[PDB]
């Protein structure tokens, strides 16, 4: 679906994307570039062969930490709105 | 900080983690393993050397999609709570 180029962390990639997610792909690219840049500056000599793995585990933990709030406040506000509806 | 060992997507990794984030790291590894495992058979033959890059861009977009709601509902509920504070 209209394959497009990316150049991320000094490593060219080719991903096909729907036209409506293109800008989201670009912004994800910048977020990943910045995350891996901060990871490289974190250490002097490391295994860069695994750096993107860390850059994905960190964002998965950062995904779940805030994704649980999705149903947290959802259930809170559902129960509050049901009870308010039932009173009046 | 007590460097831990992981085996993700057939690729041994070594990360040092605080003791309290151990289980979060394990569940992050399971999420990443499942994401890449589903990414493998999406295409029969591909550039597998890039697969973790898509496995990280996808979760970057999936993190932004839910990250915007953090400020969205916070702002909506905040204006509601101050206004009902001011009326009564």
């Amino acid at each position: 679906a209209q394959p497009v180029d990316l150049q991320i962390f000094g490593r060219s990639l080719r991903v096909n994307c729907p036209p409506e997610q293109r800008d989201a792909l670009n912004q994800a690219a910048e977020d990943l570039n910045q995350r891996l840049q901060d990871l490289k500056e974190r250490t002097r000599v490391t295994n860069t062969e695994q750096l993107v793995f860390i850059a994905a585990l960190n964002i998965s933990y950062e995904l779940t930490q805030e994704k649980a709030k999705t149903r947290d406040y959802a259930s809170s506000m559902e129960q509050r709105i049901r009870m308010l509806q039932q009173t009046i | 900080a007590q460097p831990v060992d992981l085996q993700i997507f057939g690729r041994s990794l070594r990360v040092n983690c605080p003791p309290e984030q151990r289980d979060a790291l394990n569940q992050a590894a399971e999420d990443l393993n499942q994401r890449l495992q589903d990414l493998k058979e999406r295409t029969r033959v591909t550039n597998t050397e890039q697969l973790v890059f898509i496995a990280a861009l996808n979760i970057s977009y999936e993190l932004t999609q839910e990250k915007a709601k953090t400020r969205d509902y916070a702002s909506s509920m905040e204006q509601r709570i101050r206004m009902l504070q001011q009326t009564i």
């Binding site: 506000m77 709105i81 308010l84 009046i88 | 709601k69 969205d72 509902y73 509601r80 009326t87």
Partner: peptide, 19 residues
């Protein structure tokens, strides 16, 4: 006034649900 805030809260929760 208080009668309608809960009613519009339902619309807001709906747009969250589809969000």
């Amino acid at each position: 006034m208080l009668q309608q805030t809960i009613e519009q809260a339902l619309l807001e929760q709906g747009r969250i649900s589809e969000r």
